[PDB]
Amino acid sequence: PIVQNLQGQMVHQCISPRTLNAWVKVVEEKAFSPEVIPMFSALSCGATPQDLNTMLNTVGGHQAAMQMLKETINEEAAEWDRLHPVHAGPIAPGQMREPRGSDIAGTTSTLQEQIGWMTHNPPIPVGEIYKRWIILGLNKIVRMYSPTSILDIRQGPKEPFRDYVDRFYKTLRAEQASQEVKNAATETLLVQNANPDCKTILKALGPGATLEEMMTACQ
Amino acid sequence: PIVQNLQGQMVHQCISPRTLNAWVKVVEEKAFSPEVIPMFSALSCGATPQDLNTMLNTVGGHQAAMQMLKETINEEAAEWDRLHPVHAGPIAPGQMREPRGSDIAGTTSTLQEQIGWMTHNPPIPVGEIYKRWIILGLNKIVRMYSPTSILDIRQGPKEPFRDYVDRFYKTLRAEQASQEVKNAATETLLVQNANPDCKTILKALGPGATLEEMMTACQ
Amino acid sequence: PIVQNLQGQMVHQCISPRTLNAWVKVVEEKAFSPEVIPMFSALSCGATPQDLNTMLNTVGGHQAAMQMLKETINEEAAEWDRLHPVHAGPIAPGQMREPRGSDIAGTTSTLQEQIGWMTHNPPIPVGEIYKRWIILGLNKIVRMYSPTSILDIRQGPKEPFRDYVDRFYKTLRAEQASQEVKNAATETLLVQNANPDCKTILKALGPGATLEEMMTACQ
Amino acid sequence: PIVQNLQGQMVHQCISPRTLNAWVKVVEEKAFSPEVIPMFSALSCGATPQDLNTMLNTVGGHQAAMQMLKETINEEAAEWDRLHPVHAGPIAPGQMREPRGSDIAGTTSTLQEQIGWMTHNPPIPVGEIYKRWIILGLNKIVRMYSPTSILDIRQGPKEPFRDYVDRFYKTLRAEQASQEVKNAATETLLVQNANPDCKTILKALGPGATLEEMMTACQ
Amino acid sequence: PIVQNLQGQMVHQCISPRTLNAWVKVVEEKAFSPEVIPMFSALSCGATPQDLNTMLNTVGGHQAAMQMLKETINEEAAEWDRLHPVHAGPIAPGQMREPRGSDIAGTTSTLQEQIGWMTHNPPIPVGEIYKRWIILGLNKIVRMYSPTSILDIRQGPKEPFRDYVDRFYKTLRAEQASQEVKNAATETLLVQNANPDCKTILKALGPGATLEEMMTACQ
Amino acid sequence: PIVQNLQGQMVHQCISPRTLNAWVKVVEEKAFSPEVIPMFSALSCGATPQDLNTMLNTVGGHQAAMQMLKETINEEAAEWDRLHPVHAGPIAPGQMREPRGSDIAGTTSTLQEQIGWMTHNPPIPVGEIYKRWIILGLNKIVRMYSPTSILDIRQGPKEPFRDYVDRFYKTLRAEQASQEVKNAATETLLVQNANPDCKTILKALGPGATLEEMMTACQ
């Protein structure tokens, strides 16, 4: 990653064994559970494109997902090259060349080039641009691997309302519902999918009920 | 988080794998036991709003709780915007814009904006303001998930008084009794809920008994 | 805690996940075994009152003990306020206010106030004063939870003398015998409580015997 | 490894116990799974030739692989000496000698010589040159230890298409297919090797199908 | 402990959770095996008397040993006070007082006094003096807890000579034989205590045999 | 160990709990497997003679080996004293004395003397000289504890050639064959010791076969 030292210069530091192991272990334990993505984002704080490729490449399983992710990165790289075409022919001696999509993705750029871009005044944030592409790809993977439609999350007859709501919102998160839909589902599908006893209690609360109020009501 | 370096400047540092893992593991092991909240506060020392969202978003279960927490944050954001309305229209070039509730909560502000506020002379402490909102939300969750009324904590006939007192005060903590009530319960409900043999001994001590004296008495 | 940096200034640093976890785990594993107290003291090296409250508040069990500890802290705070009454009415602008007992205990003081006191020339050591109160409280808890009187530690007929002496001094430590009594018990209760075969051997050594000499004698 | 300090000088630092243990443990757990190679590359960030030999030499098993790796290094060293012959006879007093292949590989050079080369202005990057040779050798080992031809990865009749695609691309990675072949296999061998029900669905999609679209289709 | 910072000043740093836990765990796992003493010495590198008392006091078991250790420390403190008597009556204002035996042992001195002594030009090395006393005490404990005389370590009839030699020298180490005796036992008791078949082979080697040669001979 | 600080001075730092524990654990898990020696070398990076004795002394088992190691160190110390005799009689006031073999081995020198030598301009590298002696001793131990002659490593009739080659080269490493012999064994003993089916295939390859080619051939 790129970090600041005591002279006030942002400098390269090696990715730590602790970071490398944390990422491989969260993928081993959680696969493409939605909460893996904020973990990836946080473990890749300050990452160069080299560091992002290290993290993705240290994953041993899930090679279907990793091939889909490469396809997404290639789509984003291709859109970058459409928006930001680069001069053909020789670099000005000693000067910074403009990054292409494959430079951002770390496959045609050196670590030295990456550092040069990320530490330019002002930064050309190739690490942050590439991380955006990767997270776009990972979100597609999370949606693909979501096992269950929200339509099939219904409260069991002896299922505590809290356990049902946990399943419901775990499902909406993987299915990648907007916050607007998560906020609004409280006075639609969450009530419809409740068991008869709880649905009667929720129906009676009226509209405008907070989730806290609905959970209190069906305790 | 924001930390101080050797030039005397408060600077951004990445959230550590150790911090990320500590928080996910305490939620896995303890759920919304009351002691999770001081742990959250301490693990989020120096946190930006980005870091607070990372910690909450890395939680995989408990999505009912996480949706209630978003509802609380939205209520606090809305009260902030009532107290501190911001100018519409263009930012003064190169100058700091005033934060809105959604900027404090990290959903409409950049990490660079957050750093700018938190390191301003004097600080606009968006991390501390947002942490207050989050802890307000988490305290509601702790109360909601408290399984047992204090009225139902009664000393078993062969239950050591110490084990009963541990249950009693564990319950009052989750039910979120004020310190005044915790202090005063020693000469009310704690005696009433004691078994006959201990209640007789405590009744005789008189008023003014310390908890230490009551625990000694029923040893 | 408060630590020194490279300019020679004592500065605040966040409590570490390693410290937080060490303390919660020693309380989980050892409860109020006497050796928990030196561990608390060492894990709280440099602690602000905020940090001491974090450590105590991260404990999930033992709420009888934690309520007794609050009662002790309140007694010490009340004695502080007797010795060191503070001016009522407005703070001199920009100047340091004098701490009250509740400021020392971290319930009515800010982290900024605490730092101000602890880093004043010369320090007003609110962290060390509060730690003294807490350790006074924890020592009461250790004594309360000591399960066995020293009168009931007697050497079994096939019990190795060393195993008996370990039980004896483990008991005296929890019962909170002075060093004078621990030193002097070697030529009283330790011999009286020994089995017949060892008591005969120890009786014959004469007075003045070192513990090493008594342990050699009954090997 | 070579790291930068506060004066702006790249300096030697000891290889950490954490790095040493991480590498030995990944070889113990994963052997020559392809993902071991990016892990080796990342754990050896900044490595001197001495550090690379330490990492390889701390491996206890797999001595067939380690002997093949030495053979590869010797081939690369021999090609280096062809491209970059060095002066015979005495070093200019106090001056830097040119590295030979065995100096790059750390067997005939001192740590001091290695540091001298790696910190020269401009660097003679003996650590990076040697790491290239080692990774060339390790890639041969990965290919040798790949247990299964891609021709024998075929979707079972009740095998979820995703599990088949994971096996397929895990196999292509170990067999060390180019990215061009991995990209193009989606509209050849991946369909041919699918079960009848999925092959019918994929045959119908037409050409141009993304992996995401094929995986959606056979969900 | 006392460590050096960047201004070139030896400064106090808190004992680390890692150090505290390492020591408690080695005593839990190894008790008073001789190898515990070099571990104590190394874990207490740079220790103040306060830090040495922390380490000893964090031990929960072995209170017979810990009482013997206090007796040894008191003997050494008493000899210090014989060699180095201190002036009675008032300290020169702002000046360093001379340490007494109980100051060296940390029971009558403050951490500030200890730092003052250890960082004086030239140091009054109270940490190193106290560590010497403690190690003297711990060596007595190791000897006391040694279970077996060297006279009773004899090679079994089907016992590999190497396993016998390991037992022999493990025993001599706990019994606290000088290096002179360990060196010389190779051509006395080690041969006498060998089984008949090995004793015949060793008898024939002649005098002057290295341990390596004796171990080769009886392989 | 000796490390560099920010003023550009090589300074003493305490051996870390992580280093101490890593070494004791590798000896517990691997004994005198050959790969323990590069691990010792790497864990002792920068070590003073004091640190090397700490590491060897923290080993609890293997006291036959540790006594042989002392014998080797004494032989090397004696050869040092032959090559580098030191002046008898008084040190020049305030000046550096020349090290004797026992000073290099840390038994008659202080840590301060060791630091003085290792940080002299130019260094008298007592840590590196002593580490050489120790590794010479440890290599003898590895050879002594090697359980099996290379003559007895023969490919089983259903043993995969790769598993046989792993045994063969694991054995040559412990028996401490030169690299020349390891390189040349590929076209001698490795073929002779192969099973009939593989020997026929290898016999036919001709001379000049790489290990990779032989392993491919007998796959």
Ligand SMILES: O=c1[nH]ccn1Cc1ccccc1
């Ligand atoms: O190296 C890796 N692992 C996952 C993605 N990448 C970068 C990449 C992107 C696109 C095609 C090929 C390689």
Ligand SMILES: O=c1[nH]ccn1Cc1ccccc1
């Ligand atoms: O990102 C997260 N996780 C939990 C809360 N937040 C911030 C937030 C607040 C309110 C609505 C939407 C998002």
Ligand SMILES: O=c1[nH]ccn1Cc1ccccc1
């Ligand atoms: O916060 C905590 N946990 C244990 C003690 N304290 C401080 C305190 C002291 C007294 C009353 C109320 C609170």
Ligand SMILES: O=c1[nH]ccn1Cc1ccccc1
């Ligand atoms: O020391 C090691 N372990 C694996 C490779 N190397 C360096 C080397 C290269 C070639 C021949 C001999 C030694």
Ligand SMILES: O=c1[nH]ccn1Cc1ccccc1
């Ligand atoms: O505090 C501890 N634990 C073990 C020794 N010490 C210091 C000490 C020495 C002698 C008498 C009393 C106390």
Ligand SMILES: O=c1[nH]ccn1Cc1ccccc1
């Ligand atoms: O202290 C230790 N442990 C193993 C070797 N050494 C140093 C030494 C060398 C020779 C004789 C005596 C002691």
